[PDB]
Amino acid sequence: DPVPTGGDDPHKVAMLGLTFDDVLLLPAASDVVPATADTSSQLTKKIRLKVPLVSSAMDTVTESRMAIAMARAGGMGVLHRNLPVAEQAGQVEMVKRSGGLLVGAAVGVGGDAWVRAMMLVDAGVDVLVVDTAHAHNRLVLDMVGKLKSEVGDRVEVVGGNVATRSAAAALVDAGADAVKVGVGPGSICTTRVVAGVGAPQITAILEAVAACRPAGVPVIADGGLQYSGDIAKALAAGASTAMLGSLLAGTAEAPGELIFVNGKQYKSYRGMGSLGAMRGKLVPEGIEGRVPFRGPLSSVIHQLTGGLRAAMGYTGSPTIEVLQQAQFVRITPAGLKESHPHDVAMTVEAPNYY
Amino acid sequence: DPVPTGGDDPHKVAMLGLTFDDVLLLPAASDVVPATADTSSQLTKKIRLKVPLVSSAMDTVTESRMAIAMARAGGMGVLHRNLPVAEQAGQVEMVKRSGGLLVGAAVGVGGDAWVRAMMLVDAGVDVLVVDTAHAHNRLVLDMVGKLKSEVGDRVEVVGGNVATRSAAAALVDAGADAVKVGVGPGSICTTRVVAGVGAPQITAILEAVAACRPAGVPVIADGGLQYSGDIAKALAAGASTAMLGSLLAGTAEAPGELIFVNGKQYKSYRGMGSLGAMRGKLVPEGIEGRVPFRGPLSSVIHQLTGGLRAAMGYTGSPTIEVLQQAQFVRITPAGLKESHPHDVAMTVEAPNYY
Amino acid sequence: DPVPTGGDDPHKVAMLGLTFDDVLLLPAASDVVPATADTSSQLTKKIRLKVPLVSSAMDTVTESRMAIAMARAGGMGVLHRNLPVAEQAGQVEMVKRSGGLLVGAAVGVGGDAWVRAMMLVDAGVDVLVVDTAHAHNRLVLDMVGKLKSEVGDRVEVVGGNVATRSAAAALVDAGADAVKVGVGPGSICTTRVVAGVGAPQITAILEAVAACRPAGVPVIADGGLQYSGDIAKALAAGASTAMLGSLLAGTAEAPGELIFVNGKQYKSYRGMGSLGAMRGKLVPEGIEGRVPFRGPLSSVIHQLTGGLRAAMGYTGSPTIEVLQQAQFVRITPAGLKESHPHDVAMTVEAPNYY
Amino acid sequence: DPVPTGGDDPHKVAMLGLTFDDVLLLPAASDVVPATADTSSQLTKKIRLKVPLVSSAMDTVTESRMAIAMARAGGMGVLHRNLPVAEQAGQVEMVKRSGGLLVGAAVGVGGDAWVRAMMLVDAGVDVLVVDTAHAHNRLVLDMVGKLKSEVGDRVEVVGGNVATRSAAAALVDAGADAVKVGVGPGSICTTRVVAGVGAPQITAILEAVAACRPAGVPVIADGGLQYSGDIAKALAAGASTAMLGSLLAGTAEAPGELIFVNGKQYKSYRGMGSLGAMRGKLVPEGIEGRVPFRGPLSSVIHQLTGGLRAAMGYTGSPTIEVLQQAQFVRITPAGLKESHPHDVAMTVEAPNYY
Numbered sequence A, B, C, D: 001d002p003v004p005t006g007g008d009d010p011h012k013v014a015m016l017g018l019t020f021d022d023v024l025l026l027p028a029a030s031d032v033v034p035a036t037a038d039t040s041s042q043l044t045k046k047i048r049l050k051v052p053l054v055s056s057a058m059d060t061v062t063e064s065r066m067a068i069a070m071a072r073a074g075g076m077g078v079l080h081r082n083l084p085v086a087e088q089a090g091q092v093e094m095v096k097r098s099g100g101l102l103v104g105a106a107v108g109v110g111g112d113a114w115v116r117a118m119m120l121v122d123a124g125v126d127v128l129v130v131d132t133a134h135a136h137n138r139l140v141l142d143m144v145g146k147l148k149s150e151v152g153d154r155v156e157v158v159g160g161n162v163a164t165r166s167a168a169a170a171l172v173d174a175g176a177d178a179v180k181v182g183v184g185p186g187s188i189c190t191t192r193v194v195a196g197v198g199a200p201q202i203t204a205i206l207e208a209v210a211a212c213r214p215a216g217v218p219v220i221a222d223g224g225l226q227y228s229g230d231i232a233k234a235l236a237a238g239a240s241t242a243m244l245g246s247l248l249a250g251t252a253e254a255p256g257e258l259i260f261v262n263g264k265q266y267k268s269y270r271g272m273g274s275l276g277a278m279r280g281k282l283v284p285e286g287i288e289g290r291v292p293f294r295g296p297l298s299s300v301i302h303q304l305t306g307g308l309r310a311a312m313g314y315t316g317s318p319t320i321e322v323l324q325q326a327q328f329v330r331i332t333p334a335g336l337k338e339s340h341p342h343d344v345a346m347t348v349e350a351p352n353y354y
């Protein structure tokens, strides 16, 4: 027979990709009440966070105020690189002056990125994130390897982003201290549409973990998360931390401009590959928009960790390491409709559901 | 090969979960006209109802008036536990003073729940429902077992909620007289979203029944039901009764406040894990809302049992026990669209379809 | 392993049901241009129609004017039975007085239905349709068998409706001259929702045909059709004719009341199991509504047969009998979106697409 | 067992058809930055384009201005045939007078189409496109074969449209220099709805390529494309070029009338099988509408090629021939929702996403 989906090559369509809305965690036998769950997890090989959450390296999400707030809440911020090197380094210093808090900073690849990285290290950064649209190439692997060789002793080096097992494996071989996963799932991202390229985020995590976990390298699940439950799903798929843009962009600490329209409150949120971000040869792979204002970061993080704690209680996971062993059930569109509230008019805002 | 959905573990995504909108009952050879169908079914091992329906233990669904009405209609109510012990016990007495009608009452786990249970038994309750978000743990199993040991002679003890075969089996082993199934399907429930945890309700029923039916323990299908046909589906999947919140919350007998907006009529309906219910450490797993007013309970129950009777006629099921042996066909989104009315503007309200 | 969808019984969920929007006909080698296609097909064992279309036996679709128009267009009407026996018989006579045109009439089961049938035969009806919600029972089979024994010589006897192979086989064994398929697909039908019972219409046809075709008994595909392409699909699945309600209810010849609202034109269309039809013990299994006015029947039939002719050209089918051998490809929701016009604002009405 | 979808014939439903929104390209190891990608590709056996894009032969898409613009941008236009032969030939001459640019022209089948073809060849056309709704028949195959025999030396001859392996193979055997694929995917097309016939476009490409690629015959993927990413998908499925209607109809160079409604700007765009096009025996297989105005063609083509270049960078494809070897992952509806921007209000127009 021909392949059921066309042509004669069984490997042309190589797998079925799932994302967060395709799966649910199965409850299991539990001696863990949400209050007693330990939410700590490895950000990188050497760095463990109290709360397994980091803020996106975006000019509408993370600058010093967000980095400070995230660290105090037990996570970490990654300072964006859409600003001069001296300014990014200064923001690292600001976070460092606020109580020796952990902080990360994004860099690109090449000579200017090298100088940026060295200035960030001098400023006391804890984590360098080599942050690129496509990490599966010699330029990114060389950057990760060279950084580890030169400053690896004082700084952890993260590489990303990937969406496959082989790209995750290449980053592991280059010496990455963590691997960041996500090609296209971002709320403001058009990569999958403009280039046609990506992998659904749950499958991308499962695949990257298949390479990283046996090598003891933590995986950061970056993009596509919209609810506390999605964080539990990402970790159960094998990630060690989750990176958030949209969920944090509406908070007081995000550096986006505060917007008032139709008697409502918003903040700007835009892709770093949007036309506006690139200006402030490649065609854009993001859009510019706004998200509703969500109040203080601390309260958002509390709701997110609370949802994670519930998941740990339901699945009998005393630690994140046990949560990573939980099982999924795949669901249909009807299952998804059933999972959200349905057939009711919401009359009151919930702090963890809008 | 890697698993088609990612990673190398075939059991990571353990099954495909179906819910009501994913399946239809197949018609079969029949000598049963709807009028002659026997809708009676076991609520628990010792208690058989004339109509296999019970009202949810929620502060917007079941208080004494609902409990009285449900019992008179041939089902039963489960009195909610969001009120002082003396008041819940008093409501049991009110139902009991109205003609020796059957009544159930929810309790939690722990010392206060124990005192509540003893007061309810003293008041003459027929069924205690140990009613928890997650029953697969020693606390709930111990509560069920201790209740059966102490008052098991005069009261039936139900345990819930579960969504897996193993959790249903644990409750059976603890001595449960029925097992209640449903993690996340409720109309006002956000568990699946906030915690990421659950199982689509048809599969959850099939799995629980695989453990309960061979032990002679009835399964209560709790949550997610929106039409009379869904009740037939739940029973065919193997449940013995169905528990309803949304479908009954809009009735005259529900204790929710009656609301007038936009020239229309509603009643409040809220999750017992909503912020408003919890107040009146855990983050909410429900929302607060309203549902349209549906009139007297009796008329709603008549329409629901009528739909069930039709299903029994179509499937050749003279009893609920035979309905539990019916077969399903799985359907696609197109099948679902075809099942509901389509391509027509409804001009008149139907008593059993809105 | 447990069954992937739950429980331990592989046959509990017995198959995957497809309907019209799930499939497309594959083009094939062709020496048939649409103009040369022969659209004739068996309505029953003895009766062949020029156009393989019949109008539904509904009080908002078929009375004498529709029956006359359908016959003149090369199809047939089935006169509804929601009126006194003498009136239904009179309408048969009216059609018969209009040029010896073919006509059918619906009857139920039991004594009154028997008298109705005899009066219809006396009036010259060509086809009796034993027309019931569920045909898989002794009452319907006996009616079909008795009618064939008593008047089978002068009248063709159709039985319906079924949605399974075994029910189709029972009707064949009872002596049915055609078998009508459709449990729940109707536009105004709530059977699948109220009772939870049915089978998606393409699979229902495939299954019924598996029983009827080897016995030389034509299958009438009844309900769910919305476009000319759906007719081609039904016939390719193995049906010999298609029965239409919605598509014909908006025509001038339908007996529904003509409605003017919002500067637009509609006609009433209602299920025969709607509360309004039943009045003019069972709960309703239909709704009451309206459909847009579509003009003269002849023009609608021309567009429908034109679409069928195109399908025959694409599939290389010179006759309906060859069309019944065509192949399908199954499609996804994306495939369905692609099939309809997309990403364009329609500015002009098309005669065969709204 | 019966076939899981109904009946006893395993080949009745022959395969599962995918289209663009069902798949994503997997990133791969890459030494190709978008800037260095070579986007050139074969239009036909003898003609290679700098940009693998051609404009649809439609009266609202391609006349001389569009043909000139496409050629200058490195693609080609196919002049439509809904106008007198002398006028179509004149437009060929106009394009030819503008710098020896490449140009194609559509013809039908039969005597008038033959005269049209000869006049187009005399006028200097580079490519004749035998352009029919259904190419799998002797009339079209004879036309292709006769054209190749008579003028094959000076002109390339394309045949279409097909949606199957066997029809593609027949065109290859007839001597086609390229095969054009697409039955029903067009934005303005109702073929799949009116006739019920077609195949989802990715599967159609895979199937046609299975016949054409081993014979060295390029495949033109015609219809259904809405984003730059879709072009990358079509080429990865094995096509050598993509034909665009909707994406180009809104450009300044399209010959559609410019429309002003609601303070917005549109241009007319209609199917060539719409009632309006056919007039200016068959029932229509297209609709008439409008699309938003998109500005100069050059800027649209730049955005489209930019997206393609990104895909080549992500997949490590230095040439289109390597892109044709890329792998897909199949996605679910959740995956598709995740791929587009989600959970954000777009506040600024993006040049490559609306």
Ligand SMILES: C[C@H](Nc1cccc(Cl)c1Cl)C(=O)Nc1ccc2oc(-c3ccncc3)nc2c1
Residues within 6 Å of the ligand: A132, A133, A134, A137, A138, A139, A191, A271, A272, A273, A274, A282, A283, A284, A285, D030, D031, D032, D033, D034, D310, D311, D313, D314
């Ligand atoms: C314009 C786009 N921006 C972008 C995309 C995803 C996420 C974020 Cl945060 C951003 Cl700012 C991009 O970098 N696109 C892009 C698209 C494809 C690329 O391929 C290679 C590359 C680099 C080195 N060797 C081989 C390939 N680099 C590429 C860059």
Ligand SMILES: C[C@H](Nc1cccc(Cl)c1Cl)C(=O)Nc1ccc2oc(-c3ccncc3)nc2c1
Residues within 6 Å of the ligand: A030, A031, A032, A033, A034, A310, A311, A313, A314, B132, B133, B134, B137, B138, B139, B191, B271, B272, B273, B274, B282, B283, B284, B285
């Ligand atoms: C806040 C939430 N409320 C809720 C959830 C579902 C339905 C209803 Cl009616 C309600 Cl009121 C809840 O109880 N969440 C929750 C979430 C996870 C839990 O895990 C354990 C637990 C208890 C004892 N041992 C182990 C785990 N208890 C848990 C409780």
Ligand SMILES: C[C@H](Nc1cccc(Cl)c1Cl)C(=O)Nc1ccc2oc(-c3ccncc3)nc2c1
Residues within 6 Å of the ligand: B030, B031, B032, B033, B034, B310, B311, B313, B314, C132, C133, C134, C137, C138, C139, C191, C271, C272, C273, C274, C282, C283, C284, C285
């Ligand atoms: C009320 C409903 N009406 C209806 C349903 C489908 C299509 C149409 Cl046109 C109509 Cl008017 C109906 O007849 N429901 C119904 C529902 C289930 C039934 O089971 C049996 C039956 C009859 C004889 N033996 C066994 C079962 N008869 C049944 C009748």
Ligand SMILES: C[C@H](Nc1cccc(Cl)c1Cl)C(=O)Nc1ccc2oc(-c3ccncc3)nc2c1
Residues within 6 Å of the ligand: C030, C031, C032, C033, C034, C310, C311, C313, C314, D132, D133, D134, D137, D138, D139, D191, D271, D272, D273, D274, D282, D283, D284, D285
């Ligand atoms: C009316 C329709 N128009 C149309 C359809 C698809 C795309 C475009 Cl651009 C157009 Cl203008 C059409 O040509 N329909 C149609 C539909 C089925 C046909 O079958 C044969 C045919 C021709 C020669 N031998 C056998 C079959 N020719 C057929 C033509």
Ligand SMILES: O=c1[nH]cnc2c1ncn2[C@@H]1O[C@H](COP(=O)(O)O)[C@@H](O)[C@H]1O
Residues within 6 Å of the ligand: A056, A057, A058, A161, A182, A184, A185, A186, A187, A188, A189, A190, A191, A222, A223, A224, A225, A243, A244, A245, A246, A247, A270, A271, A272, A273, A274, A285, A286, A287
């Ligand atoms: O413009 C872009 N194109 C593609 N991805 C982006 C772009 N900007 C940010 N991202 C990614 O999207 C993530 C945020 O996704 P979110 O949490 O779903 O909003 C970031 O952490 C980046 O990985």
Ligand SMILES: O=c1[nH]cnc2c1ncn2[C@@H]1O[C@H](COP(=O)(O)O)[C@@H](O)[C@H]1O
Residues within 6 Å of the ligand: B056, B057, B058, B161, B182, B184, B185, B186, B187, B188, B189, B190, B191, B222, B223, B224, B225, B243, B244, B245, B246, B247, B270, B271, B272, B273, B274, B285, B286, B287
């Ligand atoms: O806040 C909550 N979170 C989760 N489930 C709830 C909550 N409150 C009530 N439930 C469940 O939802 C069921 C009612 O679902 P419904 O019939 O779909 O509205 C109840 O019987 C409980 O099992």
Ligand SMILES: O=c1[nH]cnc2c1ncn2[C@@H]1O[C@H](COP(=O)(O)O)[C@@H](O)[C@H]1O
Residues within 6 Å of the ligand: C056, C057, C058, C161, C182, C184, C185, C186, C187, C188, C189, C190, C191, C222, C223, C224, C225, C243, C244, C245, C246, C247, C270, C271, C272, C273, C274, C285, C286, C287
């Ligand atoms: O009230 C009803 N309930 C269920 N089916 C109905 C009812 N009334 C008519 N039908 C069926 O629906 C068909 C018409 O479907 P339509 O062509 O999709 O509108 C009829 O030919 C009957 O088989």
Ligand SMILES: O=c1[nH]cnc2c1ncn2[C@@H]1O[C@H](COP(=O)(O)O)[C@@H](O)[C@H]1O
Residues within 6 Å of the ligand: D056, D057, D058, D161, D182, D184, D185, D186, D187, D188, D189, D190, D191, D222, D223, D224, D225, D243, D244, D245, D246, D247, D270, D271, D272, D273, D274, D285, D286, D287
């Ligand atoms: O009326 C029609 N019916 C069917 N297909 C059409 C019709 N007119 C144009 N087409 C096809 O649709 C393609 C354009 O599709 P689009 O790029 O999705 O708008 C053309 O290149 C033709 O192959």
Ligand SMILES: [K+]
Residues within 6 Å of the ligand: A338, A339, A340, A341, A342, B184, B185, B186, B187, B188, B189, B190, B191, B192
């Ligand atoms: K829910």
Ligand SMILES: [K+]
Residues within 6 Å of the ligand: B338, B339, B340, B341, B342, C184, C185, C186, C187, C188, C189, C190, C191, C192
């Ligand atoms: K229906």
Ligand SMILES: [K+]
Residues within 6 Å of the ligand: C338, C339, C340, C341, C342, D184, D185, D186, D187, D188, D189, D190, D191, D192
């Ligand atoms: K289309």
Ligand SMILES: [K+]
Residues within 6 Å of the ligand: A184, A185, A186, A187, A188, A189, A190, A191, A192, D338, D339, D340, D341, D342
């Ligand atoms: K996205």
